[PDB]
Amino acid sequence: TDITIYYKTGWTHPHIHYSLNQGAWTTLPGVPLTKSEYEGYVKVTIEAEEGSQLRAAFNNGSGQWDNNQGRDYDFSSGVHTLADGRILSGTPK
């Protein structure tokens, strides 16, 4: 149901800035990701109803962005890890 994301990064104030099910975009720079139980990863869990989808781009809280070469990243309900351009399900590998 909720969208949970693990994101690999060295940035110290990483943010995910997203639009949930095609609605309003978050206010910039977005929602900050918290330090995770996995070396080099941060995590956020975005609350969402069944069958939800978000569009996201990630940033350092300041304008260095990771936006999947301008296309942004898509996520569905469930857990995912974004590592170096690539989404995989579940928690970090």
Ligand X SMILES: OC[C@H]1O[C@H](O[C@H]2[C@H](O)[C@@H](O)[C@@H](O[C@H]3[C@H](O)[C@@H](O)[C@@H](O[C@H]4[C@H](O)[C@@H](O)[C@@H](O[C@H]5[C@H](O)[C@@H](O)[C@@H](O)O[C@@H]5CO)O[C@@H]4CO)O[C@@H]3CO)O[C@@H]2CO)[C@H](O)[C@@H](O)[C@@H]1O
Cβ proximity to ligand X, 3 vs 92, nearer residue? 3
39-68 residues in contact with ligand X (CB under 6 A) are 57, 65, 67
13-42 residues in contact with ligand X (CB under 6 A) are 17, 25
Cβ proximity to ligand X, 19 vs 91, nearer residue? 19
Q: Are 15 and 61 in contact, with CB atoms under 8 Å apart? A: yes
Cβ proximity to ligand X, 41 vs 58, nearer residue? 58
Least separation in angstroms between CB 52 and ligand X:
17
Euclidean distance between CA atoms 62 and 37, whole angstroms? 25
